[PDB]
PDB file of C-alpha atoms in Angstrom:
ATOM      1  CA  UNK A 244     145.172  94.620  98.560  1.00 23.86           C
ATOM      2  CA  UNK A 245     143.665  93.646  94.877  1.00 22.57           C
ATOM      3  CA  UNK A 246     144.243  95.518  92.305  1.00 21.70           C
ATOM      4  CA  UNK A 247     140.990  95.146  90.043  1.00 19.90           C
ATOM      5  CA  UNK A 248     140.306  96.071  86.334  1.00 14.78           C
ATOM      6  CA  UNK A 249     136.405  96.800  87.338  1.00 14.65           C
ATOM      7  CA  UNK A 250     136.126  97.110  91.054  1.00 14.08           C
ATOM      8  CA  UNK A 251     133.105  97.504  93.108  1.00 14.91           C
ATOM      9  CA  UNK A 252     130.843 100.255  91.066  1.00 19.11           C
ATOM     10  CA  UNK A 253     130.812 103.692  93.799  1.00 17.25           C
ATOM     11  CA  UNK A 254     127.709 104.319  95.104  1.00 18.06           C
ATOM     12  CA  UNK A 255     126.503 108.188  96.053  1.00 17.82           C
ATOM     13  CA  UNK A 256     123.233 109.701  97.595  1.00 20.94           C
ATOM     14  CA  UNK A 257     121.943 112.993  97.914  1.00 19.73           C
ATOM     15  CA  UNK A 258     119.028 114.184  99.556  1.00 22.00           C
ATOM     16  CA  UNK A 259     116.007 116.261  96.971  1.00 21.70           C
ATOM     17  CA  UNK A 260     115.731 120.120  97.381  1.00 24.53           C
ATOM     18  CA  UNK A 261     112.326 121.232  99.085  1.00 20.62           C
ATOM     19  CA  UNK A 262     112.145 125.069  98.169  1.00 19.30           C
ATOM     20  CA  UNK A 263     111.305 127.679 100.698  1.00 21.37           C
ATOM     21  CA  UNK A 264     107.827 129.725  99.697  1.00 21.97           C
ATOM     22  CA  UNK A 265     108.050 131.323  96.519  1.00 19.93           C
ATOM     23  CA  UNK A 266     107.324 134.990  95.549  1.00 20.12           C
ATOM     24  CA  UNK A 267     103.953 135.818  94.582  1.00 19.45           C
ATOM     25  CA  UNK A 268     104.915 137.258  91.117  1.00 19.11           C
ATOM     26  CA  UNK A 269     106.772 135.103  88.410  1.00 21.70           C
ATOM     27  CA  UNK A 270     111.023 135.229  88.551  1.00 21.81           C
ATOM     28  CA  UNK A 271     112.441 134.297  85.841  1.00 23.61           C
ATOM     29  CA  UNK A 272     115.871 133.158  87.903  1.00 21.27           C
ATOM     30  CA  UNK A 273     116.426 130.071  89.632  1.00 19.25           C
ATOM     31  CA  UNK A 274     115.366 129.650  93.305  1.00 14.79           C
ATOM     32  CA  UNK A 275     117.949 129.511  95.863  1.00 19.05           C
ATOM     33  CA  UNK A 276     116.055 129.378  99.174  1.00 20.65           C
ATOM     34  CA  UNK A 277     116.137 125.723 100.539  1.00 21.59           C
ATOM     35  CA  UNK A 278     114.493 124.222 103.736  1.00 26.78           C
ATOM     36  CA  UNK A 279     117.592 122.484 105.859  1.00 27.27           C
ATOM     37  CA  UNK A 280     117.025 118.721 106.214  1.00 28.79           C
ATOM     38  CA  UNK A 281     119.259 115.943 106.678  1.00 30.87           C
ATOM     39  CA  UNK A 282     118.161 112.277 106.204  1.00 28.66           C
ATOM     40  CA  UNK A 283     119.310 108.797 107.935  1.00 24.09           C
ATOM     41  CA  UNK A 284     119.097 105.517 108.115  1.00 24.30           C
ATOM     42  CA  UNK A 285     120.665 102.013 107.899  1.00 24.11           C
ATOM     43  CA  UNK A 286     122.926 100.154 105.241  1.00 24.96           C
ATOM     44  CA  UNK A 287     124.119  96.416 105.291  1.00 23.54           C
ATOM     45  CA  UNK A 288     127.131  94.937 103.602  1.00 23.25           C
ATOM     46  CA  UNK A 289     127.382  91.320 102.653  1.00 19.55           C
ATOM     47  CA  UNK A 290     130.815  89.843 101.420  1.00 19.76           C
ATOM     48  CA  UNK A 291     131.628  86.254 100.559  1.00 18.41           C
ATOM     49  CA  UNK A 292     135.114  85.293 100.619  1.00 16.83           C
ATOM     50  CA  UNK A 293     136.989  82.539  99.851  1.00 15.40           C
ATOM     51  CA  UNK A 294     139.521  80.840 101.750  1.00 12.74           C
ATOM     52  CA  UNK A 295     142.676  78.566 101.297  1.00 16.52           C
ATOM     53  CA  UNK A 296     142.909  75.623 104.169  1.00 16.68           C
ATOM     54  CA  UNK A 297     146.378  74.244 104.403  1.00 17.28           C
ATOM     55  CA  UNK A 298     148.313  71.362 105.118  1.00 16.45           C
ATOM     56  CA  UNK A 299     151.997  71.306 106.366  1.00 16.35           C
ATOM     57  CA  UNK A 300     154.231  68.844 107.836  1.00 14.15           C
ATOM     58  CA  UNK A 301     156.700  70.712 109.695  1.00 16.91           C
ATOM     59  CA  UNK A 302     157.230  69.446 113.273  1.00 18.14           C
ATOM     60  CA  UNK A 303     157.057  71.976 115.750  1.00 16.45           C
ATOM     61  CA  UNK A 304     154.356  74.506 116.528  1.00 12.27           C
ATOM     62  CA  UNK A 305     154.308  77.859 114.557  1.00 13.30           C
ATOM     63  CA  UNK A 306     153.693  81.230 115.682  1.00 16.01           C
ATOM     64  CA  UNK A 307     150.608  82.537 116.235  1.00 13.68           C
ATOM     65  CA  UNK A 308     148.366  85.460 117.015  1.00 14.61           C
ATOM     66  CA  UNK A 309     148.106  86.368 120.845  1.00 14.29           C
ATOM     67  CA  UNK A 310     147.055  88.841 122.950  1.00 12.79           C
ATOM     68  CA  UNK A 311     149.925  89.562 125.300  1.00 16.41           C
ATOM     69  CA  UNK A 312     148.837  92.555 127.403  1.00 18.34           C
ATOM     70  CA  UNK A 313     149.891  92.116 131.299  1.00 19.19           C
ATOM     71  CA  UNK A 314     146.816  94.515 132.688  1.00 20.82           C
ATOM     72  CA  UNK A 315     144.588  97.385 131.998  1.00 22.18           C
ATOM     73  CA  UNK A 316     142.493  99.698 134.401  1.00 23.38           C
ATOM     74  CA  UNK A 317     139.012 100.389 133.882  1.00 22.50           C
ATOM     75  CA  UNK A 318     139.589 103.520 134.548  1.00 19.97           C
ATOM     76  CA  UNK A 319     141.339 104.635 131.895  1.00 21.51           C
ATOM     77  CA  UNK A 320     141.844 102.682 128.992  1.00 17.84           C
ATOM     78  CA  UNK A 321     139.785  99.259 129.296  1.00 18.37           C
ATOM     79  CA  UNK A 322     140.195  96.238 127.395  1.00 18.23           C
ATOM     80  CA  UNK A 323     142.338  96.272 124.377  1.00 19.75           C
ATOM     81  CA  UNK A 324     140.360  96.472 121.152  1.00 19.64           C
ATOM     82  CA  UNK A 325     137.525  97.575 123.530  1.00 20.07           C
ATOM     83  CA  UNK A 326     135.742 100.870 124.446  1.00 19.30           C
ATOM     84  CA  UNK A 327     137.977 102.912 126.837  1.00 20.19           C
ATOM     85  CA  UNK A 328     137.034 105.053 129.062  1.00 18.44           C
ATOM     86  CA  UNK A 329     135.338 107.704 127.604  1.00 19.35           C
ATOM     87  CA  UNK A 330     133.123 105.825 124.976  1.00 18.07           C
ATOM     88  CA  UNK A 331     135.981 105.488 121.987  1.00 18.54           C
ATOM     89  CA  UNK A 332     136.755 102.489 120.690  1.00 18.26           C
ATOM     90  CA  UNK A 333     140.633 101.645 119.895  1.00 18.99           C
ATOM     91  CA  UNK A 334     142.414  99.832 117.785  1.00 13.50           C
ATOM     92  CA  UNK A 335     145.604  98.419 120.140  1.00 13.13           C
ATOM     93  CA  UNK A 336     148.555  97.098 117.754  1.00 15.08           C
ATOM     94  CA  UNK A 337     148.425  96.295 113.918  1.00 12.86           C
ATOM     95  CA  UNK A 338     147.812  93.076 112.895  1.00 13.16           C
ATOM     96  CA  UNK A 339     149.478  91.348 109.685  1.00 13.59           C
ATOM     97  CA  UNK A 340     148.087  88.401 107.920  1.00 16.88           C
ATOM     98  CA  UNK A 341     151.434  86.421 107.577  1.00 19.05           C
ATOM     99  CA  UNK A 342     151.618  84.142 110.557  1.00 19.39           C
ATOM    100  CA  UNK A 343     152.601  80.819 109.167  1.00 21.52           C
ATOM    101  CA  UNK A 344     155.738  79.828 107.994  1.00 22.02           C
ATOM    102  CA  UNK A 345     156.288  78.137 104.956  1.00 24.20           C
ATOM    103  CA  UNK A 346     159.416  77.179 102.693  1.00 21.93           C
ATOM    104  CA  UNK A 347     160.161  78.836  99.513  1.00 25.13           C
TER     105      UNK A 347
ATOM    106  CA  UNK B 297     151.221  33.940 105.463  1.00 23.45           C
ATOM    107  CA  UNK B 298     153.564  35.337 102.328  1.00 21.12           C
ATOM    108  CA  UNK B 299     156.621  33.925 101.829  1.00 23.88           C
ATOM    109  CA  UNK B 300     160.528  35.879 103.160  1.00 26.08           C
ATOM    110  CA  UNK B 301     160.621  37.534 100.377  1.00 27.16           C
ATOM    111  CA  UNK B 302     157.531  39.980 100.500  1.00 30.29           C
ATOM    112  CA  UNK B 303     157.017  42.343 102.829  1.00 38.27           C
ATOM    113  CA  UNK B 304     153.941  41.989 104.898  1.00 42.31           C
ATOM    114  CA  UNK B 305     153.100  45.755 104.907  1.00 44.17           C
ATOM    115  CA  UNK B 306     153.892  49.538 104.556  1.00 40.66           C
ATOM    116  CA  UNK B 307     154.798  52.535 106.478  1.00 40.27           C
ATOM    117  CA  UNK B 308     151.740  54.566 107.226  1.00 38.15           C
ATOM    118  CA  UNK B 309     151.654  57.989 109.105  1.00 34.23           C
ATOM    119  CA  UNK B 310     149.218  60.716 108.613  1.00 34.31           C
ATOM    120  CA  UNK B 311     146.662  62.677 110.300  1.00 32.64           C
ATOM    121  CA  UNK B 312     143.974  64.176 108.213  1.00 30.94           C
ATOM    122  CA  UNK B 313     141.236  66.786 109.473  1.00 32.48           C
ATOM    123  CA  UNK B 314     137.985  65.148 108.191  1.00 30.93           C
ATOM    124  CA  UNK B 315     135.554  67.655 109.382  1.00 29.10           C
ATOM    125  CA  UNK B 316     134.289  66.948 113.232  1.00 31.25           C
ATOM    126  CA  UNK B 317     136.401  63.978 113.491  1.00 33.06           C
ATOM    127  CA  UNK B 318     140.406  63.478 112.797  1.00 34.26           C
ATOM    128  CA  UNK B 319     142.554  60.592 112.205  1.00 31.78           C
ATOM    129  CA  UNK B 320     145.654  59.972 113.532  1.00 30.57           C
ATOM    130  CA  UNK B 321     148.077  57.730 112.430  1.00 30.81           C
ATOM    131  CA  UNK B 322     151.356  56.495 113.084  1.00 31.51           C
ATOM    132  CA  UNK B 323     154.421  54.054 113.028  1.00 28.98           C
ATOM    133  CA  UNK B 324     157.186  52.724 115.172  1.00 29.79           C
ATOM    134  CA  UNK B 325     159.711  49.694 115.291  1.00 26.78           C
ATOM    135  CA  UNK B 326     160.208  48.296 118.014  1.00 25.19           C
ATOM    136  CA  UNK B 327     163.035  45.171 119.640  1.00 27.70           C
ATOM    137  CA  UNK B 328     161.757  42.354 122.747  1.00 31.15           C
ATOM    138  CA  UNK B 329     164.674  40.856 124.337  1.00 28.05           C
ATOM    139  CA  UNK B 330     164.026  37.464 126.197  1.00 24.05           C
ATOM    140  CA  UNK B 331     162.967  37.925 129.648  1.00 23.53           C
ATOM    141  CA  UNK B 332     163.790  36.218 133.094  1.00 22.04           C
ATOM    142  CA  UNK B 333     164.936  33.050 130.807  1.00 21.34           C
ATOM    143  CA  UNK B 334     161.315  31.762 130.184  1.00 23.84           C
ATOM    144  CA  UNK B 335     160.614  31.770 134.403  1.00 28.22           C
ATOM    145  CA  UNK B 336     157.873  32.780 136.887  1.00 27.67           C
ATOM    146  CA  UNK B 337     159.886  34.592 139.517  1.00 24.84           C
ATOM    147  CA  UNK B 338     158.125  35.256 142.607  1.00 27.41           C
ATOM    148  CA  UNK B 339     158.899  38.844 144.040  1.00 25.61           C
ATOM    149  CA  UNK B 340     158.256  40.293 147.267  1.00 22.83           C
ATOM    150  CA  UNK B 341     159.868  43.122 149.244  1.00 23.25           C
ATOM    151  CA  UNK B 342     159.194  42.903 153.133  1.00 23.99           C
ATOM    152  CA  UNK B 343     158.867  46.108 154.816  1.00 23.66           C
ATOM    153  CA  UNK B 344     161.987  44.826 157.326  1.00 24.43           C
ATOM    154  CA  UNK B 345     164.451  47.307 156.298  1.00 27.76           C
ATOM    155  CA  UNK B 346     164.998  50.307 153.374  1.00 27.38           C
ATOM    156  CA  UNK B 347     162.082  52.590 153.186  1.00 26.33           C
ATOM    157  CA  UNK B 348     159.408  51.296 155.398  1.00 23.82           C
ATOM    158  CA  UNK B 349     156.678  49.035 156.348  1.00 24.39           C
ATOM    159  CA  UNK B 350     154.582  51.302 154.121  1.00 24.88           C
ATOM    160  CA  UNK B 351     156.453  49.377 150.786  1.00 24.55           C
ATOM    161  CA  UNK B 352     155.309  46.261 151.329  1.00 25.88           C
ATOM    162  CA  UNK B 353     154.798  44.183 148.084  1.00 24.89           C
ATOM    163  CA  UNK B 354     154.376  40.312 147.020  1.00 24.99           C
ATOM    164  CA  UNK B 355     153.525  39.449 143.392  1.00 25.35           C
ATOM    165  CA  UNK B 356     155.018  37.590 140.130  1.00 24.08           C
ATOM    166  CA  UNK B 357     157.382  38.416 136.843  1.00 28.49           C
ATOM    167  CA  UNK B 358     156.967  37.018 133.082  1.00 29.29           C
ATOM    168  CA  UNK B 359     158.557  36.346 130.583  1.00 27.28           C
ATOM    169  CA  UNK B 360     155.974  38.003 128.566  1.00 25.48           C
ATOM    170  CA  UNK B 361     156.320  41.622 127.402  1.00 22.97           C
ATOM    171  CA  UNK B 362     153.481  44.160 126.241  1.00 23.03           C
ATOM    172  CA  UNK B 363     152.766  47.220 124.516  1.00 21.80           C
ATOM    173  CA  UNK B 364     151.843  50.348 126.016  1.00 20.48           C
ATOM    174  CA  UNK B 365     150.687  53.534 123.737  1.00 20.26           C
ATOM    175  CA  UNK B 366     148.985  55.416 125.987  1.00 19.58           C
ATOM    176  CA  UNK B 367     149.893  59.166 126.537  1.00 20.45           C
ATOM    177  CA  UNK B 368     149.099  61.644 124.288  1.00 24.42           C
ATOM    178  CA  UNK B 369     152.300  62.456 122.357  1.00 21.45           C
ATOM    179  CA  UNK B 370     152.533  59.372 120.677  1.00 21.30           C
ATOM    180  CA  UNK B 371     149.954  60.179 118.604  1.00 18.80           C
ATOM    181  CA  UNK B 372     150.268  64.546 117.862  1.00 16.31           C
ATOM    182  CA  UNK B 373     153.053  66.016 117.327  1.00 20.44           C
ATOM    183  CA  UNK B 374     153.618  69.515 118.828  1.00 23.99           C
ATOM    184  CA  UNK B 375     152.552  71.083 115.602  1.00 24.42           C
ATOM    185  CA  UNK B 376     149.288  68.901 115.368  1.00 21.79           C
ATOM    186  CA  UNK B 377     148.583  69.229 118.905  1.00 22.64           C
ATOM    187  CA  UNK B 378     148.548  73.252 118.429  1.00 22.59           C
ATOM    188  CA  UNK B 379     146.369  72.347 115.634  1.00 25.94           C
ATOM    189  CA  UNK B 380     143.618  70.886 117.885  1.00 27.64           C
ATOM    190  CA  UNK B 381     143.881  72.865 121.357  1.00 27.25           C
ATOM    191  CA  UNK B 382     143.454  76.545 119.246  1.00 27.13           C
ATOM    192  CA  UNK B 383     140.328  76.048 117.393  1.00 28.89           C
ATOM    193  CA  UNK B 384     138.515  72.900 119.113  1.00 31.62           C
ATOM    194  CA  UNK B 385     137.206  73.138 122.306  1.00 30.99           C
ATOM    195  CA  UNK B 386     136.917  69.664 122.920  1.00 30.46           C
ATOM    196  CA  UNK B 387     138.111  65.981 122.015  1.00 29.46           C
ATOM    197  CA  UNK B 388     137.056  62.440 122.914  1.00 30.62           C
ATOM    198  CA  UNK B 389     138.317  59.215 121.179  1.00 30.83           C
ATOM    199  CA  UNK B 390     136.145  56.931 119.147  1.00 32.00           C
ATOM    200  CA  UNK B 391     137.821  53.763 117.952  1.00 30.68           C
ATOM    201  CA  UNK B 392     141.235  52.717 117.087  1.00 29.21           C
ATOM    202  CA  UNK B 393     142.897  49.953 115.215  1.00 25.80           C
ATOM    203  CA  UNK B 394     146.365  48.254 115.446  1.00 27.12           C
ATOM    204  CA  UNK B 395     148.443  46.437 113.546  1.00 27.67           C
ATOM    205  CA  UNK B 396     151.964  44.442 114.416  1.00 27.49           C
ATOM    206  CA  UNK B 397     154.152  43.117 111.364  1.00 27.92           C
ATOM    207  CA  UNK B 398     157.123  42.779 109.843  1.00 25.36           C
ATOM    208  CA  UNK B 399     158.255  40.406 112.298  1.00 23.69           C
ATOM    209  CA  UNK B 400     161.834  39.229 111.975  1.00 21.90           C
ATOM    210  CA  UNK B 401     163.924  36.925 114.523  1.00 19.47           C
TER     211      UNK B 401
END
């Protein structure tokens, strides 16, 4: 990856205390009786990148990318880099960026 | 028009990816011998004998001689061609120039 002098600033949530019903009388200590919650919701992430389009003149085709998998049954694993069976998803092979060959 | 001495143009071959059209472009030297000695031959094959009725043909020869560019690999090459078929899903030609020089006897 990029090694960055200031990367992307971390970002961290927590949830307020709501405190269970107090004593009647005044305690000096702190309180230590909570009501259990948990919260939810959404997040989006937007990324712009930028790209480098190439021209080479080399004559014959390059090596690509493929998906070379003969067959899969339904019944047990499904489609590569699709949900199997059981509601997982899975990630079939790894996948390097350096496809295209180019001269030193 | 210019005289022996210039040349009456250059070697060009590219293609260049403009966006949702592409330009090909391309080169080749070619050599016309004289044909049939400047005659009209008639030509005919009867169907009398050799394979069949069924090949049958009258027409005529000339001395002239053409060009013929049409197939596809004349104007890709495999690695331009791999180019196209992987990211566009379809292709239909628009215009096309041509140009003969160099001529030499």
């Amino acid at each position: 990856g990029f090694g960055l002098k200031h990367p992307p600033p971390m970002i961290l949530i927590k949830n307020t205390p709501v405190p269970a019903d107090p004593p009647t009388t005044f305690n000096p200590m702190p309180q230590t009786s909570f009501i259990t919650e948990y919260s939810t919701g959404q997040v989006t992430v937007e990324m712009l990148w930028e790209v480098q389009k190439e021209s080479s003149k080399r004559w014959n085709p390059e090596v690509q990318f493929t998906s070379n998998f003969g067959t899969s049954d339904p019944a047990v694993d499904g489609i590569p880099f699709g949900i199997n069976n059981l509601g997982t998803y899975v990630e079939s092979r790894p996948i390097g960026t350096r496809y295209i060959s180019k001269h030193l | 028009a210019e005289g022996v001495g210039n040349s009456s143009g250059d070697w060009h071959c590219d293609t260049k990816w403009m966006g949702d059209h592409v330009i090909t472009k391309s080169t080749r030297t070619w050599v016309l011998p004289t044909y049939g000695n400047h005659l009209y031959g008639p030509i005919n094959f009867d169907g009398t004998t050799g394979s069949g009725a069924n090949a049958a043909y009258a027409g005529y020869k000339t001395p002239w001689g053409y060009f013929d560019f049409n197939r596809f690999h004349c104007h890709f090459s495999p690695r331009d061609w791999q180019r196209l078929i992987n990211n566009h899903t379809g292709i239909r030609p628009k215009g096309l120039k041509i140009k003969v020089f160099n001529v030499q006897v």
